[PDB]
Symmetry: C3
Subunit: 126 residues, 3 copies
């Protein structure tokens, strides 16, 4: 069996962030966005949403919220590919933000590469 | 005291994943496998396991579970070294899976590199 | 409107680690140290603290605690800059350790780089 076994997507949200969707819906939407790229197998996109309970942004005594994602793909794609993927996620994430804290909400997406030569993967059958 | 201060190993398991071992036992087996490589000081191998409470694999309405590790080592080793480390961990992780969701469980391991020139470390004495 | 949208700082502490102050206060100290570098916008420094409940260090049956941070900045800075940033954080972290386990506490800091060409960012207005 040949399978990509990636991408891995980790979405971190401060506990005070308010979204327009449930976390499940956000994960669904992020995964649909990634699948729509045509670069990934449907069952290979593996995403998680992590609530941050202990966070600080800057030094000011200002209530703030933030939302960050890190998309990890296999090495080898070109710059334009990586940039497009990050932008497609950022659109999904930014669109899901209802609000949080007492000012605007920073949304960021990193796209990073995993060394495919050393990436190990298996499926453990049911 | 000269010490490596690494590697760092992070294991992530979806909340629906059943294992044959406790998380702590799985960490012990992973650390044993890493120490058996002969590449690391005994006290320098630092591992942690996290359960992902909010996750989604793909878009299909199929219950799925997955297990992932990210091993971080200092830069400067060759490709063969990195590949071998990842394979060793992948065998441990795959061995630990009992089952989850309604189909097979994808297991993956990334081996990544940390810039040793900027890596800061200290031992705060007892 | 123009904003850095980073750095991102993740601090991980074993559950048995005793700190001189709370996790919130440690995050404040870390953010203050990063801001004092003169390299970052005040609102762009985004930090979070995780307590690790399932952790193992080495293979020996000895109680041990550890503390690790990963600072992620945009690619492009020189070696001396990355090293200085890591050292500044390492000082803060090391100074926060009261104790933990039955021997010294390993403290470490990785400084890693995100690809700026693919890094996507937005502020969702209030
Ligand atoms: Na991981
Ligand atoms: Na985190």
């Amino acid at each position: 069996l040949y399978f990509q076994g990636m991408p891995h997507l980790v979405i971190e949200a401060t506990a005070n962030l308010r979204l327009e969707t449930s976390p499940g819906e956000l994960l669904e939407q992020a995964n649909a966005a990634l699948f729509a790229s045509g670069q990934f197998g449907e069952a290979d996109i593996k995403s998680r949403f992590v609530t941050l309970e202990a966070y600080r942004q800057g030094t000011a005594a200002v209530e703030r919220a933030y939302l960050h994602a890190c998309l990890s793909i296999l090495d080898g794609r070109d710059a334009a590919t990586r940039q497009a993927l990050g932008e497609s996620l950022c659109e999904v994430l930014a669109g899901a933000v209802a609000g949080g804290g007492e000012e605007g909400v920073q949304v960021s997406v990193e796209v990073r590469e995993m060394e495919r030569a050393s990436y190990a993967k298996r499926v453990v059958a049911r």
